[PDB]
């Protein structure tokens, strides 16, 4: 199989984390693609009228509070 990067069709700054646009599970960086479709739907990679985005990312938990 090919388990290598998926060079974001939106940013392409090494798509480290992942946001898979469903039901065509193309993995863009965490919710990068989301931004793209909202303005330009029909997936940048396979012109599908996207439904949801799943973020099966690891070891997260940033910030302290909400503002400070
Ligand atoms: Zn990206
Ligand atoms: Zn797609």
Short mmCIF file of C-alpha atoms and ligand atoms in Angstrom, two decimals:
data_model
loop_
_atom_site.label_atom_id
_atom_site.label_comp_id
_atom_site.label_asym_id
_atom_site.label_seq_id
_atom_site.Cartn_x
_atom_site.Cartn_y
_atom_site.Cartn_z
CA UNK A 1 0.00 0.00 0.00
CA UNK A 2 0.92 3.72 -0.14
CA UNK A 3 0.85 5.31 3.34
CA UNK A 4 2.54 8.63 2.45
CA UNK A 5 1.53 12.35 2.69
CA UNK A 6 -1.50 13.74 0.79
CA UNK A 7 -0.03 17.12 -0.30
CA UNK A 8 -3.11 19.33 0.49
CA UNK A 9 -4.94 20.33 -2.76
CA UNK A 10 -5.69 23.51 -0.71
CA UNK A 11 -2.47 24.62 1.09
CA UNK A 12 0.19 21.92 0.44
CA UNK A 13 2.56 22.88 3.24
CA UNK A 14 2.94 19.18 4.13
CA UNK A 15 -0.62 18.17 5.24
CA UNK A 16 0.65 16.85 8.67
CA UNK A 17 -2.64 16.48 10.60
CA UNK A 18 -5.80 15.19 8.91
CA UNK A 19 -9.34 16.19 8.06
CA UNK A 20 -10.85 13.59 5.71
CA UNK A 21 -13.61 15.04 3.57
CA UNK A 22 -16.36 12.40 3.41
CA UNK A 23 -17.82 10.40 1.87
CA UNK A 24 -14.63 10.67 -0.29
CA UNK A 25 -12.23 10.49 2.70
CA UNK A 26 -9.47 12.51 1.04
CA UNK A 27 -7.25 13.64 3.90
CA UNK A 28 -6.45 17.34 3.85
CA UNK A 29 -4.68 19.00 6.95
CA UNK A 30 -7.04 19.33 9.96
CA UNK A 31 -10.09 21.07 8.52
CA UNK A 32 -8.07 22.95 5.77
CA UNK A 33 -10.33 21.60 3.00
CA UNK A 34 -13.47 22.58 4.96
CA UNK A 35 -12.58 26.24 4.30
CA UNK A 36 -12.12 25.40 0.59
CA UNK A 37 -15.47 23.59 0.01
CA UNK A 38 -17.62 26.18 1.91
CA UNK A 39 -16.71 28.66 -0.88
CA UNK A 40 -15.82 26.14 -3.61
CA UNK A 41 -17.72 22.81 -2.95
CA UNK A 42 -17.24 19.68 -5.14
CA UNK A 43 -14.00 18.48 -3.56
CA UNK A 44 -10.73 20.10 -4.88
CA UNK A 45 -9.62 16.52 -5.61
CA UNK A 46 -12.75 14.60 -6.74
CA UNK A 47 -15.64 17.09 -7.27
CA UNK A 48 -18.03 15.47 -4.71
CA UNK A 49 -20.61 17.61 -2.80
CA UNK A 50 -18.90 16.86 0.57
CA UNK A 51 -20.92 15.87 3.62
CA UNK A 52 -18.69 15.66 6.72
CA UNK A 53 -15.06 15.91 7.86
CA UNK A 54 -13.52 13.54 10.39
CA UNK A 55 -10.33 14.40 12.22
CA UNK A 56 -8.63 11.19 13.27
CA UNK A 57 -5.57 13.04 14.54
CA UNK A 58 -3.44 12.18 17.63
CA UNK A 59 -2.06 13.67 20.88
CA UNK A 60 -3.86 17.05 20.94
CA UNK A 61 -4.87 19.50 23.76
CA UNK A 62 -3.50 23.06 23.37
CA UNK A 63 -4.16 26.40 25.15
CA UNK A 64 -4.96 26.96 28.85
CA UNK A 65 -8.37 28.67 28.97
CA UNK A 66 -10.46 30.14 26.08
CA UNK A 67 -9.01 33.69 25.82
CA UNK A 68 -6.04 33.76 28.25
ZN1 LIG B 1 -3.32 21.90 4.58
ZN1 LIG B 2 -12.58 13.94 -2.68
#
